[PDB]
């Protein structure tokens, strides 16, 4: 019993973090096979960040201008290339700790674990969701750039995020491992607008199912609703509209609890209109949207990894 | 910027988890040097749990009755002994992945990371606090027994908790690594009472300081208070009394924010009496007490580990 904001074990990722230094800038890199991945703004100075011409800046750099350290192991750069917003440094040594991995571009609403790193060394691990406006509400300080987000399916590590920048609003933006930003952001120091941040409705429903599994049932009501009538109320409170694909994903949780998805939607509709009235659900006084349906099944069934 | 419930990286602990089987019971064990640590109720059947005589049950077992698996590596038991509520199995192979470690018995209010394991394999990692009544509000399923809680100081892993049982109330109880239970619990299947669970006041204050660091300042008031007048209100709301040792621990946070500890206590006193009135602090509608002063400094200054 119980429910926690649970992250994946980070051991397979800790062995891939390295320190990347170009000139005077130092940030984190990801060492897989004989390639190191890192944010391309490592080649910039503080003055370049206002309006950097990355192509012109990169041409002034050679292989010997990049210093890659894996603890005390010095890797020698024998080739460099720029793919979108990431730098790919070819090194002479393949990482012996390379796990089975793939690069994945996630969709908004999906969750992943972040291994926050500084100077190539791990600081901590936490779980977060990609917001509908393609930001993340992380915990990052200066020097955390190049920290990665990931999921684990069995023996395979799926890398999905590389941290690049903190916006002036305090939220965080980054890219996939091919260097494509999530959202409309660019890697320069300028005011950038993130869109409206909405609540991930399918995740809230999954969390309400977790509450029922763990014994919290006070919010269950006798009313029901339809999909169109629920979405009319959800959009009023800046909730994402629910689709039939979302209903299909929630199927296994409906079966385990015996509560129809539309019935759970009716309970949520009353929580949106009437509030929680000083009560709590799973130790929280707010509706939580950082747990996917898969996260709930994983935590409540005990899925393990290599 | 930002603040998350952050766990330690678990890599150093993942390499120490093994599977322990005695007869038909299988749970997790901790492999350090050539000794495996596991809960002693691994030698029990389902019927023994109601009123087990561990001494009599252990005498019917020999070294070859214990099966220890480290993935696919079979460890041979060459000696066994019972220390309080843990079993110490001497094996023939020393763990090559043994990190620098120590055994520590923590005090209530301190936090640690839990590596939840099943059949010797990691499932996830989360951060929690030892409640004042010596329980933890974890996330555990059947087979998680032997999962360990830990902290990391630089290169040293401090093991502080081994999971033993879920109480009928849904909270969790366990021992230190010398086999001494935290709290008045015993390892048998019987109704057991946990005391009143109080809020860890020094942790709430540390979290309010974290909120100020991250830009949330609406709760700061113009009033002040004394230590005796605050404790009179705190005890009314089942908060732990604040002592001078707590004030000394909060010193570095007072300096960083320029807010005196007693001034922060006055803000907390108004939050206890007037509530939060639909507002949030660090994305939460409840006062949070699972962050120690050390956790706040660590997250807001970027302390790293090996
Ligand atoms: C304003 O600096 C820019 C501009 C553009 C780009 Cl692409 C990258 C950066 C570097 C950056 O934002 N680093 C940080 C990332 N996370 C958290 C941070 C917390 C404090 C200071 C820097 C933090
Ligand atoms: C009632 O079983 C007893 C009695 C006494 C003792 Cl010493 C140990 C046990 C085993 C136990 O509680 N296992 C579990 C530990 N965490 C979570 C659990 C969730 C579901 C089922 C068992 C769970």
UniProtKB/Swiss-Prot annotation, chains A, B:
The lineage of its organism: Viruses, Riboviria, Orthornavirae, Pisuviricota, Pisoniviricetes. Residues 1-306 are cytoplasmic. Residues 1-306 form the Peptidase C30 domain. There is a cross-link at residues 5, 90 (Glycyl lysine isopeptide (Lys-Gly) (interchain with G-Cter in ubiquitin)). Changing residue 142 to A: Does not affect ability to cleave and inactivate human TRMT1. 3CL-PRO exists as monomer and homodimer. Only the homodimer shows catalytic activity. Interacts with host FBXO22; this interaction promotes the proteasomal degradation of nsp5. Inhibited by pyridone-containing alpha-ketoamides compounds 13a and 13b. In turn, alpha-ketoamide 13b (tert-butyl (1-((S)-1-(((S)-4-(benzylamino)-3,4-dioxo-1-((S)-2-oxopyrrolidin-3-yl)butan-2-yl)amino)-3-cyclopropyl-1-oxopropan-2-yl)-2-oxo-1,2-dihydropyridin-3-yl)carbamate) inhibits SARS-CoV-2 replication in human lung cells. Inhibited ex vivo by michael acceptor inhibitor N3. Inhibited ex vivo by compound 11a and 11b. The active site is at 41 (for 3cl-pro activity), 145 (nucleophile). It is found in: Host cytoplasm; Host Golgi apparatus; Host nucleus. It catalyses: TSAVLQ-|-SGFRK-NH2 and SGVTFQ-|-GKFKK the two peptides corresponding to the two self-cleavage sites of the SARS 3C-like proteinase are the two most reactive peptide substrates. The enzyme exhibits a strong preference for substrates containing Gln at P1 position and Leu at P2 position. Cleaves the C-terminus of replicase polyprotein at 11 sites. Recognizes substrates containing the core sequence [ILMVF]-Q-|-[SGACN]. Cleaves and inactivates human TRMT1, preventing tRNA guanine(26)-dimethylation of tRNAs. May cleave human NLRP1 in lung epithelial cells, thereby activating the NLRP1 inflammasome pathway. May cleave human GSDMD, triggering alternative GSDME-mediated epithelial cell death upon activation of the NLRP1 inflammasome, which may enhance the release interleukins 1B, 6, 16 and 18. Also able to bind an ADP-ribose-1''-phosphate (ADRP). Coiled coil: none annotated. This is 3C-like proteinase nsp5. It comes from Severe acute respiratory syndrome coronavirus 2.
């Amino acid at each position: 019993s119980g429910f926690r904001k649970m992250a994946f074990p980070s051991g397979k990722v800790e062995g891939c973090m390295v320190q990347v230094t170009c000139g005077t800038t130092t940030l984190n890199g990801l060492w897989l096979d004989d390639v190191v991945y890192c944010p391309r703004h490592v080649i910039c100075t503080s003055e370049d960040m206002l309006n950097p011409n990355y192509e012109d800046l990169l041409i002034r750099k050679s292989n010997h201008n990049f210093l890659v350290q894996a603890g005390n192991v010095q890797l020698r750069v024998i080739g460099h290339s720029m793919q979108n917003c990431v730098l790919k440094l070819k090194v002479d040594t393949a990482n012996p700790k390379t796990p089975k991995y793939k690069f994945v571009r996630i969709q908004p609403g999906q969750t992943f674990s972040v291994l926050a790193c500084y100077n190539g060394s791990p600081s901590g691990v936490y779980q977060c969701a990609m917001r509908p406006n393609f930001t993340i509400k992380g915990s990052f300080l200066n020097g955390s750039c190049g920290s990665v987000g990931f999921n684990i399916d069995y023996d395979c590590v799926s890398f999905c995020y590389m941290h690049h920048m903190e916006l002036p609003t305090g939220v965080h933006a980054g890219t996939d491992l091919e260097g494509n930003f999530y959202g409309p952001f660019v890697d320069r120091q300028t005011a950038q607008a993130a869109g409206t941040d909405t609540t991930i409705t399918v995740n809230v429903l999954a969390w309400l199912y977790a509450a029922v599994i763990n014994g919290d049932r006070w919010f269950l009501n006798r009313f029901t609703t339809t999909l169109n009538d629920f979405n009319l109320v959800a959009m009023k409170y800046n909730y994402e509209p629910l689709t039939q694909d979302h209903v299909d994903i929630l199927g296994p949780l409906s079966a385990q609890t015996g509560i129809a998805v539309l019935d759970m939607c009716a309970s949520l509709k009353e929580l949106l209109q009437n509030g929680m009235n000083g009560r709590t659900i799973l130790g929280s006084a707010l509706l939580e949207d950082e747990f996917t349906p898969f996260d709930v099944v994983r935590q409540c069934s005990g899925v393990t990894f290599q």
